[PDB]
Symmetry: D2
């Protein structure tokens, strides 16, 4: 059992912790770090507006939280220099605070005694970036120490494009993600760096930018220059849909598009990408463990222009992708 | 004063009524029909969850409703055969029940006394179909008697497509409309013809078909077999966005794409199609009278693949188009 | 294995089905009736916007549905006369269409082969009415054949009232329940018997009557003519709160009020009434099996005026009570 | 025309500005102060998720915003010591930032050259507190310089209780306000001082505390000790309902309760309190100018226990109350 620490016990920190309990046999979270007191932190772990009440008991004291009788040590250091992971014999830190996506800031956790860092977001200056099931077999135990799990949206779209480019060829593709609101949006009209994310999120469709499409190139180099896109934030609390419209030189049919996805989405890869012929809505993919759930019924073909649509739980699915990735790093030398 | 009656006084019905009071100096609704009593009708007219309280005063009695002191006759007739438009000298009927989209049923209103019928929806077997500002000049006062105003989505998309086809040439386009939920959806999970519109509307992204992309051919023939799409119904009560992604053989940039729209978004056409660089969100286009408001900031190019995005108040934006059209019909031969 | 059938496989229907699979070792639904086809039914059973995807596998054919490999017969019979429960040897029927709340209609199920009928609602002309945990010991296996499980609100309020009346003595109480919206409300502004339930459910606080406060007498006679109230339907899909404000002649404090509930919220009764000091919000009581979860932190006293607040998952909380009751009926004479 | 400044151009600052344009003939806002840049501020004034697009044109430059051709000067001083109102000849400042509800902090605006301050919230150490239409005739031009408009909820409930106590006598009353969420709540589950306001606001009913009931005593001294209450935050973006349940020694009927409210809600007072026999929902009282809209249909009587219900637009109605109050201060010596 490889021990793990989390820096940043927020939505994604907490999803990850839950995913470890629910989905892993060889990982154990033994310390976290956050800004807030253990009463608040334990309360947020216990109750959850999306995921429900946690199965286990939760107690806290002035320097820990105890979950199902297992003591997790908690800190609150705004500066990760001020931590010590080797104390707790932690081999992997998940950096999920969102304020250390620069790999050269993140390597501090190595300084502070860890052996591997995983960034739960797009990173900069990272040793490598991964969408598990796409480019995971390039992981290099020697030289990939500070690594990125990419973004939710990237983890949805990359699996689907790997498959579609491989069989048909994508000349150019433009994406729209119709996306659950996220917590960096305002509940009432208030100031934001971004004048649209500034608007009341639960009564609006809010267009916003995403690097998720350009970032595919990091995991599918052959697609650099070939994808762009953006997001429509819409009033559901979780669950999103990536809608890609692209050009193929190929001559393609709804049926051949769908058959390729189906053909591909098997064995281990099929745990990252699913194939569905069902009448789905967002609530149907809440708490779904695939990174990309492909909706055969939404495939449209017009001339040499294709539209395909894949679903994702932008919390849980992304987390599960990250967990696969952590498991991999944990299975190799370290 | 051309006189107007309304069959089906629901969302679009009532939007229309208000649009007339706010925006027209030569039209008057003098009668309306639905499936309910005048207490229920007077209430729904007075209080609207989207459009607010109505300015005017509202009284009812056992066969009518009065609004700023003007008596409006009301009927409760499931079947339009049993209606007498001529009793009130109604020229134009807005058919907005969404149950008489076959013009062959809707021509009943003619028999029942009306000279014209305007179906506020995609229709079948109609004399003609109009997106105002796009193909309204081909209106034939003699032969065009039962006509379609097309869908909200088609009123959004067409203005935009015309312009960009005219300038650059569309090979093929695929559309996604992110659309406010509508009456035909279920509040709770419950049976429905469409197994997705069957799911809780206000907590779901709900994909469903729409033919508004194919329906563009009806108003721009040169685009037949060239456009398709679908909708995602989402939890807002009104406001939608039309997302189109097309190929052109032309060589294009974000700037030139946007320059085309801004060039054309002027004069009378600019009252149907608008050009914006503002940082819009859906609540900003609620009660906006344009059929299509173009979001210049959302435009993207990659190779010969282009993405463009236009907003529309699917209730009020659509209704303002339908009124423009009703104003055209009424500016001409009423025989 | 007592066999069970369900008339009306809607929200509460399907909650019930799941409650049986999750929570019972001696019950089995073997047949259900509704107004739809088995494709639509199998879909709505498999995917739920609140309860999530069902664990088991689901197949259908032209007269049934199969769930973890157990065949369940399905009928599409508007009229229960045309039903044959005995064909499948069903003892207990859950009548959950919300269209057969008169026991005189619902006794049809008896004629149609059933020995008992449990109406999942306030009923009229019923043999008896039960809030489990409150007055379920007065169940008469011979004479109580068509029975009510009362409303969700009454299942929330009664446990709580009993306790506080028993300890302090209620003069009069007035209740407000802040309740998740329900199927009988409109998604868009549209005609309805109730002119407020007629308004857009998911963007409105909607006041409406409920008799759950008066209905408490049926299960606690000593409170007749002593309680009243109303509901505010608000935009969540499930989860509600019952707010009661009463007089007592006793002298009371926040602490003693709360001490009464905690004292009583134990053993079997504690499975209906819960005691919490947690910082609850509505999503925290979704999928909670208690009929009434008491929020100790919400309690207020001013003179002899007391305010108390209890939570309830109006779908799943209510359904767990209805199952307790169905479990009681089935532990006894089935003649 | 009395000139006015606003400190704090947020929800309530902006509602107030709009109310001046829409409802006043003898007030002119000529300066505001806020944290943010004029581009962001002008954008928020222009577009509004609740109130709609503003009727007028809006331009901005590096030190002002211009509305319908009228230049409003804008500042951004975190510390109101750093301002000068007499420069712009401002007679009344509305303190609406929410971080100067202490009257001894607020009197700075007087230091900085103003003559009257109005706090748009419960205050501490204030010269007086007012619910216009209840205790406004006690305003003392000489000695009421730093004053409070009370809270939205107080402005709903005080008018209704003045009437009901006067005719029936309230022994004791407990309130629940079913309240639109406010912007001090979290959009996603995140830390808050208050563990319930910490929870996703648009998918929850969130119980929270309010002083609004105890505060009635400030405007109706005869009711001290006699009222308490709390709030249920619910997912509508504006519009709320005060539900009061109380004891009367009197012997009362639905009909006599309603007739008293109706009887009272006339002339000027009836502009603060309305009487309604209509089938209202929250959206019906959006943008309603009364502080309290009394819902006759919701009156319940059981023994000597009464429940009455009054609506309020917790943004706009409260604002309009505040505007009446400002108009009063503006009509007297100053
Ligand atoms: N849809 C999603 O939510 C989603 C999906 C994929 C990736 N991501 C990415 O994952 C990351 C996690 O974001 P989140 O949604 O969990 O955010 P969140 O705000 O909900 O939670 C993050 C937590 O980090 C804590 N924090 C902030 N600064 C800190 C610091 N210096 N030290 C320690 N703790 C600190 C906060 O208190 C908060 O509780 C972000 O980079 C985000 O972009 C989010
Ligand atoms: N976003 C929009 O709402 C939108 C936009 C464009 C077009 N439309 C189309 O306009 C039509 C009306 O839509 P709506 O949103 O007003 O729906 P709606 O349900 O609000 O309007 C229908 C009204 O007509 C009444 N009605 C139904 N059947 C009737 C009958 N047989 N005879 C008389 N009255 C009858 C109903 O009771 C209701 O009051 C639909 O076809 C719809 O697709 C809607
Ligand atoms: N919060 C709750 O939902 C709640 C709580 C307690 C009690 N109840 C009561 O339970 C009853 C059912 O409520 P629901 O929420 O499941 O509503 P629902 O509409 O979800 O359930 C009704 C189902 O029965 C079907 N049906 C309708 N008429 C029928 C008929 N004549 N014959 C056969 N099937 C028919 C419908 O198609 C639907 O599938 C109502 O009386 C309701 O008041 C509901
Ligand atoms: N329902 C309501 O919204 C409501 C009703 C009645 C009273 N109130 C009260 O009125 C006050 C106004 O709150 P709001 O809802 O407008 O809040 P808000 O956060 O929506 O807007 C307040 C604005 O103040 C600005 N601000 C913060 N600190 C500042 C400072 N030091 N200097 C200058 N500007 C500063 C912020 O940038 C923000 O834009 C609060 O005390 C609130 O409790 C609110």
């Amino acid at each position: 059992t490889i021990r793990v620490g989390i820096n940043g016990f927020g939505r994604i920190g907490r999803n990850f912790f839950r995913a470890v309990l629910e989905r892993s046999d060889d990982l154990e979270v033994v310390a976290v770090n956050d800004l807030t007191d253990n009463k608040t932190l334990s309360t947020l772990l216990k109750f959850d507006s999306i995921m429900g009440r946690l199965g286990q008991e939760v107690e806290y004291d002035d320097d820990s939280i105890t979950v199902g009788g297992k003591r997790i040590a908690v800190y609150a250091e705004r500066d990760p220099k001020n931590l010590d992971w080797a104390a707790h014999n932690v081999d992997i830190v998940i950096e999920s605070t969102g304020f250390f996506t620069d790999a050269n800031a993140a390597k501090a956790h190595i300084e502070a005694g860890a052996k591997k860092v995983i960034i739960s977001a797009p990173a900069s200056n990272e040793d490598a970036t991964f969408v598990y099931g796409v480019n995971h077999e390039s992981y290099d135990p020697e030289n990939h120490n500070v690594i990125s799990g990419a973004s939710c949206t990237t983890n949805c779209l990359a699996p689907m494009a790997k498959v579609l480019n491989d069989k048909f060829g994508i000349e150019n593709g433009l994406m729209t993600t119709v996306h659950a609101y996220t917590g960096d949006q305002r509940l009432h009209d208030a100031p934001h760096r971004d004048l649209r994310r500034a608007r009341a999120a639960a009564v609006n469709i809010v267009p916003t930018s995403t690097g998720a499409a350009k970032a595919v190139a990091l995991v599918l180099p052959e697609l650099k220059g070939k994808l762009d896109g953006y997001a429509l934030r819409v009033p559901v609390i979780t669950g999103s849909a990536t809608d890609l419209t692209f050009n193929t030189k190929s001559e393609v049919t709804v049926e051949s598009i769908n058959a390729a996805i189906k053909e591909a989405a098997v064995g281990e890869f099929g745990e990252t990408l699913a194939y569905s012929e069902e009448p789905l809505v967002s609530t149907d993919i809440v708490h779904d463990s695939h990174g990309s759930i492909f909706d055969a019924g939404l495939t449209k073909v017009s001339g040499n222009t294709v539209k395909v649509v894949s679903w994702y739980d932008n919390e849980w699915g992304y987390t599960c992708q990250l967990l696969r990735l952590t498991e991999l790093v944990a299975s190799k030398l370290l």
